[PDB]
Design a protein around this motif. Structure first.
Motif, short mmCIF file in Angstrom:
data_model
loop_
_atom_site.label_atom_id
_atom_site.label_comp_id
_atom_site.label_asym_id
_atom_site.label_seq_id
_atom_site.Cartn_x
_atom_site.Cartn_y
_atom_site.Cartn_z
N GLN A 1 -55.20 -22.17 -17.28
CA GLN A 1 -55.29 -23.64 -18.78
C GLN A 1 -56.77 -24.69 -18.94
OE1 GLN A 1 -52.10 -22.95 -19.15
NE2 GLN A 1 -51.70 -25.89 -19.06
N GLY A 2 -57.37 -23.93 -17.84
CA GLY A 2 -59.02 -24.61 -18.15
C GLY A 2 -60.34 -24.21 -17.29
N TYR B 1 -63.99 -23.01 -10.65
CA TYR B 1 -63.30 -23.13 -10.82
C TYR B 1 -61.96 -23.10 -12.36
CZ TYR B 1 -63.07 -23.47 -5.07
OH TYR B 1 -62.95 -23.36 -4.66
N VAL B 2 -61.34 -22.43 -12.03
CA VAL B 2 -60.48 -22.05 -13.40
C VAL B 2 -60.03 -22.77 -12.71
CG1 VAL B 2 -61.61 -19.70 -14.33
CG2 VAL B 2 -59.07 -20.45 -13.12
N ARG C 1 -62.97 -16.18 -14.29
CA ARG C 1 -63.85 -17.46 -14.77
C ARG C 1 -64.32 -16.23 -16.31
NH1 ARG C 1 -69.89 -17.35 -12.38
NH2 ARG C 1 -69.97 -18.64 -13.09
N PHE C 2 -64.35 -15.05 -16.14
CA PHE C 2 -64.60 -14.60 -17.58
C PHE C 2 -63.09 -14.57 -18.14
CE2 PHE C 2 -67.20 -13.02 -14.15
CZ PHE C 2 -68.52 -13.28 -14.98
N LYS D 1 -56.13 -24.97 -8.81
CA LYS D 1 -57.60 -25.02 -8.97
C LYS D 1 -57.79 -23.90 -8.44
CE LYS D 1 -58.29 -29.57 -9.70
NZ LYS D 1 -60.58 -30.44 -8.63
N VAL D 2 -58.20 -22.76 -8.95
CA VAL D 2 -58.50 -20.91 -7.88
C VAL D 2 -60.51 -20.60 -8.85
CG1 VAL D 2 -57.64 -18.23 -7.93
CG2 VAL D 2 -56.18 -20.24 -8.69
N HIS D 3 -60.55 -20.73 -7.54
CA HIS D 3 -62.05 -20.48 -7.94
C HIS D 3 -62.31 -18.85 -9.13
CE1 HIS D 3 -66.29 -19.08 -6.85
NE2 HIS D 3 -66.17 -20.35 -5.90
#
Ligand SMILES: [Mg+2]
Ligand SMILES: [Mg+2]
Ligand SMILES: [Mg+2]
Ligand SMILES: [Mg+2]
Ligand SMILES: [Mg+2]
Ligand SMILES: [Mg+2]
Ligand SMILES: [Mg+2]
Ligand SMILES: [Mg+2]
Ligand SMILES: [Mg+2]
Ligand SMILES: [Mg+2]
Ligand SMILES: [Mg+2]
Ligand SMILES: [Mg+2]
Ligand SMILES: [Mg+2]
Ligand SMILES: [Mg+2]
Ligand SMILES: [Mg+2]
Ligand SMILES: [Mg+2]
Ligand SMILES: [Mg+2]
Ligand SMILES: [Mg+2]
Ligand SMILES: [Mg+2]
Ligand SMILES: [Mg+2]
Ligand SMILES: [Mg+2]
Ligand SMILES: [Mg+2]
Ligand SMILES: [Mg+2]
Ligand SMILES: [Mg+2]
Ligand SMILES: [Mg+2]
Ligand SMILES: [Mg+2]
Ligand SMILES: [Mg+2]
Ligand SMILES: [Mg+2]
Ligand SMILES: [Mg+2]
Ligand SMILES: [Mg+2]
Ligand SMILES: [Mg+2]
Ligand SMILES: [Mg+2]
Ligand SMILES: [Mg+2]
Ligand SMILES: [Mg+2]
Ligand SMILES: [Mg+2]
Ligand SMILES: [Mg+2]
Ligand SMILES: [Mg+2]
Ligand SMILES: [Mg+2]
Ligand SMILES: [Mg+2]
Ligand SMILES: [Mg+2]
Ligand SMILES: [Mg+2]
Ligand SMILES: [Mg+2]
Ligand SMILES: [Mg+2]
Ligand SMILES: [Mg+2]
Ligand SMILES: [Mg+2]
Ligand SMILES: [Mg+2]
Ligand SMILES: [Mg+2]
Ligand SMILES: [Mg+2]
Ligand SMILES: [Mg+2]
Ligand SMILES: [Mg+2]
Ligand SMILES: [Mg+2]
Ligand SMILES: [Mg+2]
Ligand SMILES: [Mg+2]
Ligand SMILES: [Mg+2]
Ligand SMILES: [Mg+2]
Ligand SMILES: [Mg+2]
Ligand SMILES: [Mg+2]
Ligand SMILES: [Mg+2]
Ligand SMILES: [Mg+2]
Ligand SMILES: [Mg+2]
Ligand SMILES: [Mg+2]
Ligand SMILES: [Mg+2]
Ligand SMILES: [Mg+2]
Ligand SMILES: [Mg+2]
Ligand SMILES: [Mg+2]
Ligand SMILES: [Mg+2]
Ligand SMILES: [Mg+2]
Ligand SMILES: [Mg+2]
Ligand SMILES: [Mg+2]
Ligand SMILES: [Mg+2]
Ligand SMILES: [Mg+2]
Ligand SMILES: [Mg+2]
Ligand SMILES: [Mg+2]
Ligand SMILES: [Mg+2]
Ligand SMILES: [Mg+2]
Ligand SMILES: [Mg+2]
Ligand SMILES: [Mg+2]
Ligand SMILES: [Mg+2]
Ligand SMILES: [Mg+2]
Ligand SMILES: [Mg+2]
Ligand SMILES: [Mg+2]
Ligand SMILES: [Mg+2]
Ligand SMILES: [Mg+2]
Ligand SMILES: [Mg+2]
Ligand SMILES: [Mg+2]
Ligand SMILES: [Mg+2]
Ligand SMILES: [Mg+2]
Ligand SMILES: [Mg+2]
Ligand SMILES: [Mg+2]
Ligand SMILES: [Mg+2]
Ligand SMILES: [Mg+2]
Ligand SMILES: [Mg+2]
Ligand SMILES: [Mg+2]
Ligand SMILES: [Mg+2]
Ligand SMILES: [Mg+2]
Ligand SMILES: [Mg+2]
Ligand SMILES: [Mg+2]
Ligand SMILES: [Mg+2]
Ligand SMILES: [Mg+2]
Ligand SMILES: [Mg+2]
Ligand SMILES: [Mg+2]
Ligand SMILES: [Mg+2]
Ligand SMILES: [Mg+2]
Ligand SMILES: [Mg+2]
Ligand SMILES: [Mg+2]
Ligand SMILES: [Mg+2]
Ligand SMILES: [Mg+2]
Ligand SMILES: [Mg+2]
Ligand SMILES: [Mg+2]
Ligand SMILES: [Mg+2]
Ligand SMILES: [Mg+2]
Ligand SMILES: [Mg+2]
Ligand SMILES: [Mg+2]
Ligand SMILES: [Mg+2]
Ligand SMILES: [Mg+2]
Ligand SMILES: [Mg+2]
Ligand SMILES: [Mg+2]
Ligand SMILES: [Mg+2]
Ligand SMILES: [Mg+2]
Ligand SMILES: [Mg+2]
Ligand SMILES: [Mg+2]
Ligand SMILES: [Mg+2]
Ligand SMILES: [Mg+2]
Ligand SMILES: [Mg+2]
Ligand SMILES: [Mg+2]
Ligand SMILES: [Mg+2]
Ligand SMILES: [Mg+2]
Ligand SMILES: [Mg+2]
Ligand SMILES: [Mg+2]
Ligand SMILES: [Mg+2]
Ligand SMILES: [Mg+2]
Ligand SMILES: [Mg+2]
Ligand SMILES: [Mg+2]
Ligand SMILES: [Mg+2]
Ligand SMILES: [Mg+2]
Ligand SMILES: [Mg+2]
Ligand SMILES: [Mg+2]
Ligand SMILES: [Mg+2]
Ligand SMILES: [Mg+2]
Ligand SMILES: [Mg+2]
Ligand SMILES: [Mg+2]
Ligand SMILES: [Mg+2]
Ligand SMILES: [Mg+2]
Ligand SMILES: [Mg+2]
Ligand SMILES: [Mg+2]
Ligand SMILES: [Mg+2]
Ligand SMILES: [Mg+2]
Ligand SMILES: [Mg+2]
Ligand SMILES: [Mg+2]
Ligand SMILES: [Mg+2]
Ligand SMILES: [Mg+2]
Ligand SMILES: [Mg+2]
Ligand SMILES: [Mg+2]
Ligand SMILES: [Mg+2]
Ligand SMILES: [Mg+2]
Ligand SMILES: [Mg+2]
Ligand SMILES: [Mg+2]
Ligand SMILES: [Mg+2]
Ligand SMILES: [Mg+2]
Ligand SMILES: [Mg+2]
Ligand SMILES: [Mg+2]
Ligand SMILES: [Mg+2]
Ligand SMILES: [Mg+2]
Ligand SMILES: [Mg+2]
Ligand SMILES: [Mg+2]
Ligand SMILES: [Mg+2]
Ligand SMILES: [Mg+2]
Ligand SMILES: [Mg+2]
Ligand SMILES: [Mg+2]
Ligand SMILES: [Mg+2]
Ligand SMILES: [Mg+2]
Ligand SMILES: [Mg+2]
Ligand SMILES: [Mg+2]
Ligand SMILES: [Mg+2]
Ligand SMILES: [Mg+2]
Ligand SMILES: [Mg+2]
Ligand SMILES: [Mg+2]
Ligand SMILES: [Mg+2]
Ligand SMILES: [Mg+2]
Ligand SMILES: [Mg+2]
Ligand SMILES: [Mg+2]
Ligand SMILES: [Mg+2]
Ligand SMILES: [Mg+2]
Ligand SMILES: [Mg+2]
Ligand SMILES: [Mg+2]
Ligand SMILES: [Mg+2]
Ligand SMILES: [Mg+2]
Ligand SMILES: [Mg+2]
Ligand SMILES: [Mg+2]
Ligand SMILES: [Mg+2]
Ligand SMILES: [Mg+2]
Ligand SMILES: [Mg+2]
Ligand SMILES: [Mg+2]
Ligand SMILES: [Mg+2]
Ligand SMILES: [Mg+2]
Ligand SMILES: [Mg+2]
Ligand SMILES: [Mg+2]
Ligand SMILES: [Mg+2]
Ligand SMILES: [Mg+2]
Ligand SMILES: [Mg+2]
Ligand SMILES: [Mg+2]
Ligand SMILES: [Mg+2]
Ligand SMILES: [Mg+2]
Ligand SMILES: [Mg+2]
Ligand SMILES: [Mg+2]
Ligand SMILES: [Mg+2]
Ligand SMILES: [Mg+2]
Ligand SMILES: [Mg+2]
Ligand SMILES: [Mg+2]
Ligand SMILES: [Mg+2]
Ligand SMILES: [Mg+2]
Ligand SMILES: [Mg+2]
Ligand SMILES: [Mg+2]
Ligand SMILES: [Mg+2]
Ligand SMILES: [Mg+2]
Ligand SMILES: [Mg+2]
Ligand SMILES: [Mg+2]
Ligand SMILES: [Mg+2]
Ligand SMILES: [Mg+2]
Ligand SMILES: [Mg+2]
Ligand SMILES: [Mg+2]
Ligand SMILES: [Mg+2]
Ligand SMILES: [Mg+2]
Ligand SMILES: [Mg+2]
Ligand SMILES: [Mg+2]
Ligand SMILES: [Mg+2]
Ligand SMILES: [Mg+2]
Ligand SMILES: [Mg+2]
Ligand SMILES: [Mg+2]
Ligand SMILES: [Mg+2]
Ligand SMILES: [Mg+2]
Ligand SMILES: [Mg+2]
Ligand SMILES: [Mg+2]
Ligand SMILES: [Mg+2]
Ligand SMILES: [Mg+2]
Ligand SMILES: [Mg+2]
Ligand SMILES: [Mg+2]
Ligand SMILES: [Mg+2]
Ligand SMILES: [Mg+2]
Ligand SMILES: [Mg+2]
Ligand SMILES: [Mg+2]
Ligand SMILES: [Mg+2]
Ligand SMILES: [Mg+2]
Ligand SMILES: [Mg+2]
Ligand SMILES: [Mg+2]
Ligand SMILES: [Mg+2]
Ligand SMILES: [Mg+2]
Ligand SMILES: [Mg+2]
Ligand SMILES: [Mg+2]
Ligand SMILES: [Mg+2]
Ligand SMILES: [Mg+2]
Ligand SMILES: [Mg+2]
Ligand SMILES: [Mg+2]
Ligand SMILES: [Mg+2]
Ligand SMILES: [Mg+2]
Ligand SMILES: [Mg+2]
Ligand SMILES: [Mg+2]
Ligand SMILES: [Mg+2]
Lengths: 48, 16, 275
Positions: free
Chosen positions: C165-166, C171-172, C133-134, C183-185
């Motif tokens: 990607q976003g 999730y990213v 996320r960072f 989607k990965v957390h």
RNA sequence: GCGGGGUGGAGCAGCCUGGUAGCUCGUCGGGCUCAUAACCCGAAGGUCGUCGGUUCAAAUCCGGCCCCCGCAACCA
RNA sequence: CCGAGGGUAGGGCCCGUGACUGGGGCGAAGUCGUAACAAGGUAGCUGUACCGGAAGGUGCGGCUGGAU
RNA sequence: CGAUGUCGGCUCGUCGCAUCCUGGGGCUGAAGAAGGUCCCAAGGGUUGGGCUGUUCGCCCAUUAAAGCGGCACGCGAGCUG
RNA sequence: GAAUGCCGGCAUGAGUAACGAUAAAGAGGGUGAGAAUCCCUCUCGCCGUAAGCCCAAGGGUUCCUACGCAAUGGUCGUCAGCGUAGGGUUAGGCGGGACCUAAGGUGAAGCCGAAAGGCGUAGCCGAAGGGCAGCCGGUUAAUAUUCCGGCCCUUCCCGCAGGUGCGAUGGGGGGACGCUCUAGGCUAGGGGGACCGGAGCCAUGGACGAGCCCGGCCAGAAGCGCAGGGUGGGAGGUAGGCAAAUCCGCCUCCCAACAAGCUCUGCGUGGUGGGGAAGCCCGGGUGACAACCCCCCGAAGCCAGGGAGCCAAGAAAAGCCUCUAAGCACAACCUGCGGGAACCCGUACCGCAAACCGACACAGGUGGGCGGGUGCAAGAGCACUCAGGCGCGCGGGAGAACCCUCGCCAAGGAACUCUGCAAGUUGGCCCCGUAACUUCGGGAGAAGGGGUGCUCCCUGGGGUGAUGAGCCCCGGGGAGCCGCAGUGAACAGGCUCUGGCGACUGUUUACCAAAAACACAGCUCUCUGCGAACUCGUAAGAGGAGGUAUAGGGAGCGACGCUUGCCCGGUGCCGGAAGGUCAAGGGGAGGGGUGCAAGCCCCGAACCGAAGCCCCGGUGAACGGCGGCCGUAACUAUAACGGUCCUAAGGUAGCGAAAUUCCUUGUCGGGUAAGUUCCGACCUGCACGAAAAGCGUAACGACCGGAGCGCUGUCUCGGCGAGGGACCCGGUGAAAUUGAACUGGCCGUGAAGAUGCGGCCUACCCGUGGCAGGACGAAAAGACCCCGUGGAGCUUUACUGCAGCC
RNA sequence: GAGCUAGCCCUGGCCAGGGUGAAGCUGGGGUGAGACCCAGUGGAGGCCCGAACCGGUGGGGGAUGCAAACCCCUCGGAUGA
RNA sequence: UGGUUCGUGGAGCCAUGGGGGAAUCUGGGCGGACCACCGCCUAAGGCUAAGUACUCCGGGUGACCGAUAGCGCACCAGUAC
């Protein structure tokens, strides 16, 4: 040529020996049968 | 040879 | 850059070897190695369950640090870059200011002597590890955890990388090395940069013996066997498949999908792989 | 030895389900063009390989003969 | 000893010829189409690539020695 | 079918004669020489080689001639394979 | 009385084959009832990287000695690994245990399974790996690193002294590692000595010699010397090594560095203790106060945890060291010294074999170390030979055919034959020299040649030593000598040209196929996002992988080069929230049975209702498939061209009578005197064709074709010779087979191929050496073939189930 | 039952001698710097010849064998899959 | 789904892997689908001799064997091999 019997004292005892027989159900039935038949030796002899 | 396996009589040595 | 050989034997014609340029240390860290139990493809029943395996070079397993959130905030120095025979990437030896020594796998461009560090506040710099996320959208990244605290699972082989990607809630969205959109957390860790040793895929083994060195025993075609052995067995002379091409165990092997349909992770895979 | 076929000049429908032979090309006459081809308007030409049978009636259904491709001929 | 040359063996150049095969030149009235010359009826030419009985076609980029 | 080893070659012969040669003949559209055709005759003879597993056949070089068949397509307790 | 019956006994073959490597024997003297065969001596031959010696396994008294010879021993036997008896194996240091871990096994916790059981962390077990203290000589009929002698060493217990924060199953270090190549210095081992010691020797023509022959060492504690290995010191900070920590790790600072110091190995020396030949005389005694010295060669062994390079990246744990925690600092530990203590098992003998594995005293099989000398380029190759060990457990004669293994051959030289099968030829080293083609490496030892011994003379460089002598190692030039011949014996490629297949080195049908088959790097398709897919398992649990799409599974294709066309109608797979069909379930129009009735019970339409299938698309390096007839050109012929039928689409490039071509020995050309094969072409390709890949391709091949040169006993065409057999004599003495036999030829007959029936012909009785035509000879209840409502492997859109998956 | 055989795992061991001479390194040449060329050094390789060792290609012998797969001559691999 | 004579049959009864799930006598089960009537019996806890089976062991007895028979073994046999 190389024949099939290649005596090995450790191999003989670990494969057919008293303690290998007692470890498994089929092994104990062997000893049970050979006792009932009156076999003089229940197990191959090997010098150790 | 008879021998090998196509024929079967008169012709080769022991095996059986 | 792969190294070629002059054609002074039939096999040297095509044999290419890695240049080993980035390697700076040629014996492992004694405190980080343990013996690798070679299996030969046999399971605990003693049965071959993966065919054609055995007989490769002896190896020591180097313990790798796939959970870098173990030491948040504690910088380390890149002390060496070494050969690891258990993987395609090279590994990097890290001397933490802790005095702790660990192996990470070596990203592309990592220079011995630099510092790396892991954590939410880390610089977006090659070799650092942050929760997903960072990391800024657009960053290519490797050694990606797939679930928080479970360990790096994705993008570990030589030259691979995932690209962010976003974002979508907790999730990213990653583009995996396969081209899948997943989607990965966001709490999952990942290391900025691609894996090094990208030239890995351009090695030409060159002869049969080189497959033997790697533990790869000769693979025999189903077409070469008899019907007791394989769907493609038998026939008088050569013989086309004569049926939809099949594995030794009966199932079709050209196109038949095999991912379990009702798998819970389907909710998190956006787009199946490309190409 | 088994299988399919023979119909205007060429190549094919119709045969199974008996009464009615059709399609494209070609051929013949007339248009258009300076002329030819293309194109347009008309028309002609076949008793259905042959003989025999069933039938009120046979290209068609059933036999024989002629012919034409096709498949087969294995175990020694 | 050298020595004409003879002998053995392996090379290089030229010439002639060879089943068959490649295109080329030429040849009063053969067969197919119509690529070019008019904007020649898809402007032409072009290096290359691919394709097609044939002339040719098409792609990419180039030239005007292109009409209006 | 409680087994009668199956092509050819080699080796070793032996027999038949519907005769390839050699010996004896009649007829000839037999001048001579050389042929043709038929009859008598089985004593002896009937080559070496290229091709093919070949038998056979074609071909080369010769020959008086380069015969045809039988003997379990003669002959593997004789060989080959 | 028969079942190729069962058990036993005894026949036939037959005094026949054979008596087990062709390394080989002869005489003399003993012993004894008896001797080719046992003992001793002399002569001869054989092995000598073994056919000698030492370990390990396996075997289990076979070892030594006395007494024996019925059986065992392929003969004999007085002998023996045989019978009987007695004797024999000695360890703190060798090996294993009272130490450690590896795969694996087992397995408190824990997990799973109808039962039996299957898993499983730690832990435990598990060795030919790690760790650990003994070397030399003597002695017995038989054991010895074990007994004895000499000189060394280890651990445990206790005590004394000195020193120290002591203390661990906990932390850390270390142990601790590959392959190839390799330095310096040593040792093992070896060659030489005109030096040292020695009993002797003078032969047969010569030699009394700087003659011949023999020997000229081994072990050793401290110290010392040479050569190596390992190892920085100090201080400050510290959050990591799952408690602690002065240790280790990390940061900084000063000093020290190709050193030195310290430490540890090897080798040398070393007080001392041993050994000590030939020859002679009867294992021993002498030699002998034995001597024990110098030079050279020199390891693959040692220093060692050495050095360099490379990629395929090279065990663990304990001992050992260090750190601290409980605890305890009267302790405890460390160091030195002293006394004491030190257990269990193995030890004989064989061990490339007569004692192990092969039924045998069996030409087979069996892991490790030592394996001397000379010459040949080297070497563990080859010849001879040392130490040592053998002549192989039937012999004696003879001198046929024939067989085996071997030698030679006039003229010819592949004419042999399926085929130069086989056998010749060539053959090592040095030098000259070497083609197409090629992926530039190769092809290559291409091909083809010349040299090769000995003697004298001159001379260049190296090693050791000293720079020199000596020894040793690489050469250079000149002059000669002998023979048929100089790698004089032995070991040691025949070559070339041209096709097919497979790129290559590899692998395979143990025991009829080694190949073109399999594999192979490389290419493509496809599956798999990780508790992956897939695989084994009822499961737990494993493999995959302590890997993560540059990764893992499946499939085909098979280096490399140039390429890989058209068809998606059928099958497969992929995509498709519509529609069609669709089971259990929902629903309950409407019926039915029964009861006086409430009710109880049963059937049941529409309709909702998954996957699968239908349906709509995609997809070929998915399964696969890639036309027919008729006409047409100004000689003919042939059709660039056209017509029409059909298909999902009608085979592209390349190649082609082919590992594929039926007709076929197609036709033409090449090679040959002659060519059903071969090579080059043509194309009416019965029935090539593009990853069941198409066409090529340098190099490679115990692959399969064709040709040539060389050379030959393959052949014309056979001859002679050698040895082992065959033959004769003495010894021992099988076998399959066998209804019984007094067992001839022809021509017939017969169930159709007669010694056995008929008629004739022939023939005295019995053997030995030979040959194979018959006894439809022997062997194996025909594998071919059929039959059996016999069996088994295998296949599939045969039937029906099951796993598995949905 | 894997003491034969097949694969794998753990741990050890073995492979005489001779030949060819890759990369790299060094020096020299070359160039603006280079690539590159030459020499020396070096010692790579399912490289070459050949024992041990592992095989089993062709032929002969053997065939109630020495042997229920052997013997002789010849031949393949021999730092590697 | 098993048991029973009962193989899906008109298929009850007994047992039970899955789902739903009571009541305490005016409760509950059975009498071969079901219903009524008429009867029978009291589920979801346990124990219980004897009459029955067998013959390693001992004894008695055979129109049982008599050494190829009778046990594999009359004997040093589950031995030798
Ligand atoms: Mg074997
Ligand atoms: Mg046996
Ligand atoms: Mg063994
Ligand atoms: Mg043992
Ligand atoms: Mg053992
Ligand atoms: Mg064992
Ligand atoms: Mg066991
Ligand atoms: Mg046991
Ligand atoms: Mg049990
Ligand atoms: Mg007893
Ligand atoms: Mg037992
Ligand atoms: Mg037989
Ligand atoms: Mg290369
Ligand atoms: Mg090159
Ligand atoms: Mg090469
Ligand atoms: Mg690298
Ligand atoms: Mg460790
Ligand atoms: Mg593993
Ligand atoms: Mg296990
Ligand atoms: Mg597998
Ligand atoms: Mg495997
Ligand atoms: Mg690596
Ligand atoms: Mg990997
Ligand atoms: Mg997640
Ligand atoms: Mg790759
Ligand atoms: Mg490997
Ligand atoms: Mg592979
Ligand atoms: Mg394969
Ligand atoms: Mg096959
Ligand atoms: Mg096969
Ligand atoms: Mg199987
Ligand atoms: Mg099957
Ligand atoms: Mg199958
Ligand atoms: Mg098939
Ligand atoms: Mg096949
Ligand atoms: Mg086929
Ligand atoms: Mg195919
Ligand atoms: Mg097919
Ligand atoms: Mg299939
Ligand atoms: Mg599946
Ligand atoms: Mg995907
Ligand atoms: Mg029509
Ligand atoms: Mg019709
Ligand atoms: Mg009609
Ligand atoms: Mg009409
Ligand atoms: Mg009619
Ligand atoms: Mg009529
Ligand atoms: Mg047949
Ligand atoms: Mg058939
Ligand atoms: Mg002259
Ligand atoms: Mg013209
Ligand atoms: Mg035009
Ligand atoms: Mg136009
Ligand atoms: Mg135009
Ligand atoms: Mg076009
Ligand atoms: Mg028969
Ligand atoms: Mg018989
Ligand atoms: Mg018979
Ligand atoms: Mg007249
Ligand atoms: Mg005559
Ligand atoms: Mg006669
Ligand atoms: Mg014939
Ligand atoms: Mg013929
Ligand atoms: Mg002909
Ligand atoms: Mg004449
Ligand atoms: Mg004849
Ligand atoms: Mg006849
Ligand atoms: Mg006949
Ligand atoms: Mg016939
Ligand atoms: Mg015959
Ligand atoms: Mg024969
Ligand atoms: Mg024959
Ligand atoms: Mg016979
Ligand atoms: Mg016979
Ligand atoms: Mg044959
Ligand atoms: Mg009778
Ligand atoms: Mg019987
Ligand atoms: Mg019997
Ligand atoms: Mg008997
Ligand atoms: Mg008997
Ligand atoms: Mg008796
Ligand atoms: Mg008898
Ligand atoms: Mg008698
Ligand atoms: Mg007798
Ligand atoms: Mg006889
Ligand atoms: Mg015999
Ligand atoms: Mg013999
Ligand atoms: Mg003997
Ligand atoms: Mg011999
Ligand atoms: Mg001999
Ligand atoms: Mg004598
Ligand atoms: Mg004598
Ligand atoms: Mg004697
Ligand atoms: Mg005697
Ligand atoms: Mg003696
Ligand atoms: Mg004498
Ligand atoms: Mg024994
Ligand atoms: Mg005796
Ligand atoms: Mg005796
Ligand atoms: Mg006696
Ligand atoms: Mg005896
Ligand atoms: Mg014997
Ligand atoms: Mg005596
Ligand atoms: Mg002692
Ligand atoms: Mg004790
Ligand atoms: Mg154990
Ligand atoms: Mg243990
Ligand atoms: Mg040990
Ligand atoms: Mg010890
Ligand atoms: Mg000692
Ligand atoms: Mg004594
Ligand atoms: Mg280490
Ligand atoms: Mg290590
Ligand atoms: Mg080790
Ligand atoms: Mg020494
Ligand atoms: Mg020497
Ligand atoms: Mg601290
Ligand atoms: Mg004395
Ligand atoms: Mg060695
Ligand atoms: Mg060492
Ligand atoms: Mg170390
Ligand atoms: Mg390497
Ligand atoms: Mg461990
Ligand atoms: Mg105190
Ligand atoms: Mg201390
Ligand atoms: Mg004790
Ligand atoms: Mg002993
Ligand atoms: Mg041996
Ligand atoms: Mg012996
Ligand atoms: Mg013997
Ligand atoms: Mg010596
Ligand atoms: Mg030599
Ligand atoms: Mg040696
Ligand atoms: Mg002898
Ligand atoms: Mg011997
Ligand atoms: Mg004689
Ligand atoms: Mg000679
Ligand atoms: Mg002579
Ligand atoms: Mg001659
Ligand atoms: Mg010649
Ligand atoms: Mg000649
Ligand atoms: Mg010839
Ligand atoms: Mg001949
Ligand atoms: Mg030679
Ligand atoms: Mg050249
Ligand atoms: Mg040439
Ligand atoms: Mg050439
Ligand atoms: Mg070429
Ligand atoms: Mg070249
Ligand atoms: Mg070259
Ligand atoms: Mg040369
Ligand atoms: Mg050549
Ligand atoms: Mg000379
Ligand atoms: Mg001389
Ligand atoms: Mg050679
Ligand atoms: Mg192959
Ligand atoms: Mg090959
Ligand atoms: Mg290739
Ligand atoms: Mg290949
Ligand atoms: Mg090889
Ligand atoms: Mg075989
Ligand atoms: Mg076998
Ligand atoms: Mg076999
Ligand atoms: Mg076999
Ligand atoms: Mg081969
Ligand atoms: Mg294969
Ligand atoms: Mg293959
Ligand atoms: Mg490829
Ligand atoms: Mg399974
Ligand atoms: Mg794992
Ligand atoms: Mg190429
Ligand atoms: Mg090429
Ligand atoms: Mg194309
Ligand atoms: Mg399709
Ligand atoms: Mg489609
Ligand atoms: Mg389709
Ligand atoms: Mg299909
Ligand atoms: Mg549905
Ligand atoms: Mg296909
Ligand atoms: Mg098909
Ligand atoms: Mg199809
Ligand atoms: Mg015409
Ligand atoms: Mg096309
Ligand atoms: Mg052709
Ligand atoms: Mg071809
Ligand atoms: Mg074909
Ligand atoms: Mg043909
Ligand atoms: Mg033919
Ligand atoms: Mg011809
Ligand atoms: Mg022609
Ligand atoms: Mg033709
Ligand atoms: Mg094919
Ligand atoms: Mg090959
Ligand atoms: Mg080959
Ligand atoms: Mg030839
Ligand atoms: Mg001869
Ligand atoms: Mg002789
Ligand atoms: Mg006599
Ligand atoms: Mg006798
Ligand atoms: Mg005897
Ligand atoms: Mg009788
Ligand atoms: Mg009689
Ligand atoms: Mg008689
Ligand atoms: Mg007679
Ligand atoms: Mg008859
Ligand atoms: Mg007769
Ligand atoms: Mg008679
Ligand atoms: Mg009568
Ligand atoms: Mg009679
Ligand atoms: Mg007569
Ligand atoms: Mg006699
Ligand atoms: Mg005789
Ligand atoms: Mg006979
Ligand atoms: Mg015969
Ligand atoms: Mg006969
Ligand atoms: Mg008979
Ligand atoms: Mg006969
Ligand atoms: Mg039978
Ligand atoms: Mg039969
Ligand atoms: Mg039979
Ligand atoms: Mg058979
Ligand atoms: Mg047959
Ligand atoms: Mg039949
Ligand atoms: Mg039937
Ligand atoms: Mg029947
Ligand atoms: Mg049947
Ligand atoms: Mg089931
Ligand atoms: Mg074993
Ligand atoms: Mg080697
Ligand atoms: Mg050389
Ligand atoms: Mg050099
Ligand atoms: Mg270097
Ligand atoms: Mg090699
Ligand atoms: Mg060479
Ligand atoms: Mg080479
Ligand atoms: Mg052989
Ligand atoms: Mg030969
Ligand atoms: Mg045999
Ligand atoms: Mg030999
Ligand atoms: Mg070699
Ligand atoms: Mg029942
Ligand atoms: Mg019922
Ligand atoms: Mg229930
Ligand atoms: Mg109540
Ligand atoms: Mg009641
Ligand atoms: Mg009451
Ligand atoms: Mg009630
Ligand atoms: Mg009830
Ligand atoms: Mg009731
Ligand atoms: Mg009741
Ligand atoms: Mg109750
Ligand atoms: Mg009750
Ligand atoms: Mg008796
Ligand atoms: Mg008896
Ligand atoms: Mg009796
Ligand atoms: Mg009894
Ligand atoms: Mg009995
Ligand atoms: Mg007994």
């Amino acid at each position: 040529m190389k024949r099939t019997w290649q005596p090995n004292r450790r191999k003989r005892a670990k494969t057919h020996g008293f303690r290998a027989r007692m470890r498994t159900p089929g092994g104990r039935k062997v000893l049970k049968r050979r006792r009932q038949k009156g076999r003089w030796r229940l197990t191959p002899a090997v010098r150790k | 040879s008879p021998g090998n396996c196509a024929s079967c009589s008169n012709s080769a040595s022991a095996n059986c | 850059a792969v190294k070629k050989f002059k054609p002074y034997t039939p096999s040297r014609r095509f044999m290419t070897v890695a240049d080993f340029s980035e390697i700076t240390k040629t014996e492992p860290e004694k405190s980080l190695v343990k013996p690798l139990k070679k299996t030969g493809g046999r399971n605990n029943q003693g049965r071959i369950t993966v065919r054609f395996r055995g007989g490769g070079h002896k190896r020591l397993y180097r313990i790798i640090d796939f959970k870098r959130w173990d030491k948040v905030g504690i910088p380390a120095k890149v002390a060496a870059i070494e050969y690891d025979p258990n993987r395609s990437a090279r590994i990097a030896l890290l001397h933490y200011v802790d005095g702790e020594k660990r192996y990470i796998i070596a990203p592309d461009g990592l220079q011995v002597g630099q510092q790396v560090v892991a954590g939410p506040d880390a610089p977006i710099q090659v070799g650092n590890a942050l929760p997903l996320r960072f990391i800024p959208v657009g960053t290519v990244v490797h050694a990606v955890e797939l679930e928080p605290k479970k360990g790096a699972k994705l993008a570990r082989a030589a030259g691979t990388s995932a690209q962010i990607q976003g974002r979508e809630g907790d999730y990213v969205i990653l583009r995996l090395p396969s081209g899948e959109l997943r989607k990965v957390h966001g709490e999952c860790y990942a290391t900025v940069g691609a894996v090094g040793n990208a030239d890995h895929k351009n090695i030409v083994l060159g002869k049969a013996g080189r497959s033997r060195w790697l533990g790869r025993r000769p693979h025999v075609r189903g077409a070469a066997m008899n019907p007791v052995d394989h769907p493609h067995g038998g026939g008088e002379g050569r013989a086309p498949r004569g049926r939809p091409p099949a594995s030794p165990w009966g199932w079709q092997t050209k196109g038949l999908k095999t991912r379990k349909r009702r798998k819970p992770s389907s909710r998190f895979i956006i787009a199946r792989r490309k190409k």
